[PDB]
């Protein structure tokens, strides 16, 4: 067994560097600045993932600064960080040591879809609720993730615990300070991003979250396409042509362009006939052109679609307890504190 030691700083708690030892290193994925490793910490036996991110000498790394201040059961935990060399010669890389989670929402979704089966709705409810909580939490700091997609939703399939990860695009949005439009991944981008807006809000994450919900209900992405124009055609086929008033809420530079002229498809026909009507209702309040008309994450947690999760006797299909769903904090509740009446049921 090859043991490796490094000097590293705890992700949370005091800034005192400590000796960290790990072993059982093995490649588990590919990253944008080098491959991603798994390792086992010698002191606890816990598995971690180690991701390289490449340090800017001019700026503090934004992802590291965000990760150090987040503490939530549905967000991946930063255990340690340290600097090293790596792929490119002479380059210094930031290494983020994250708690390892073995699967993703995308893996589970593809497993059902390949089998031509639909994900059981109880899991759709559990996953989407946990994602909306993670989003309520980061949004309460003003932090927008900007790359919500199924592959960024870590999942422990045994316990049904979901954790949001990959904050490499996240940013604290400030009104009246522009943001690059080129973030968020194909299939999940809000139409104001497709239109190249620089003045969007955290509601781009809610659109992406609606895309994930629709995907879980359909067994395939709802707005596929390799170009923004192909993606927009799929959006227009569902929502219909945006009005000039809607376009001006998305990007007013686009109001006078020629768009495909298409009537909205009825929401009840977008999904299979036996899709639960509350899921369709929820989806229709997330996939809205007007960004301010989309539900907030906290409003989405309180939606009727999630009422089964507030039932005292709800259980996982495998017979286990559901994960923690009601340990809201003042921080997490701050966008609308008296939603706790729905959010925290009596037995909590």
């Amino acid at each position: 067994s090859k043991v490796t030691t490094v000097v590293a700083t705890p992700g949370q708690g005091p800034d005192r560097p400590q000796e960290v030892s790990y072993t059982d290193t093995k490649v588990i994925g590919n990253g944008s600045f080098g491959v991603v490793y798994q390792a086992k910490l010698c002191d606890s036996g816990e598995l971690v993932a180690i991701k390289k991110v490449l340090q800017d000498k001019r700026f503090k790394n934004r992802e590291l600064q965000i990760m150090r201040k987040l503490d939530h059961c549905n967000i991946v935990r930063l255990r340690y960080f340290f600097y090293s060399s790596g792929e490119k010669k002479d380059e210094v890389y930031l290494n983020l040591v994250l708690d390892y989670v073995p699967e993703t929402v995308y893996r589970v979704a593809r497993h059902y879809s390949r089998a031509k089966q639909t994900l059981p709705v109880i899991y759709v409810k559990l996953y989407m609720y946990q994602l909306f909580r993670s989003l309520a939490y980061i949004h309460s700091f003003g932090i927008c993730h900007r790359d919500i997609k199924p592959q960024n939703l870590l999942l422990d399939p045994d316990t049904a615990v979901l954790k949001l990860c990959d904050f490499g695009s996240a940013k604290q949005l400030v009104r009246g300070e522009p943001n690059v439009s080129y973030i968020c991944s194909r299939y999940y981008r809000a139409p104001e991003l497709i239109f190249g807006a620089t003045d969007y809000t955290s509601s781009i994450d809610v659109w992406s979250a609606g895309c994930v919900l629709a995907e879980l209900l359909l067994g395939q992405p709802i707005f596929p396409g390799d170009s923004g124009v192909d993606q927009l055609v799929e959006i227009i086929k569902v929502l219909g042509t945006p009005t000039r008033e809607q376009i001006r809420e998305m990007n007013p530079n686009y109001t006078e362009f020629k768009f495909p002229q298409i009537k909205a498809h009825p929401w009840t026909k977008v999904f299979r006939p036996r899709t639960p009507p509350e899921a369709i209702a929820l989806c229709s309040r997330l996939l809205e052109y007007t960004p301010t008309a989309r539900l907030t994450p906290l409003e989405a947690c309180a939606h009727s679609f999630f009422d089964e999760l507030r039932d005292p006797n709800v259980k996982l299909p495998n017979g286990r307890d559901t994960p923690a769903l009601f340990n809201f904090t003042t921080q997490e509740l701050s966008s609308n504190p008296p939603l706790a009446t729905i959010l925290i049921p009596p037995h909590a």
Binding site: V27, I28, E103, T104, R107, Q151
Partner: peptide, 11 residues
């Protein structure tokens, strides 16, 4: 496909 990890219990 577009998977995060190389390995999975579902493949």
């Amino acid at each position: 496909e577009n998977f995060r990890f190389f390995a999975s219990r579902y493949c």
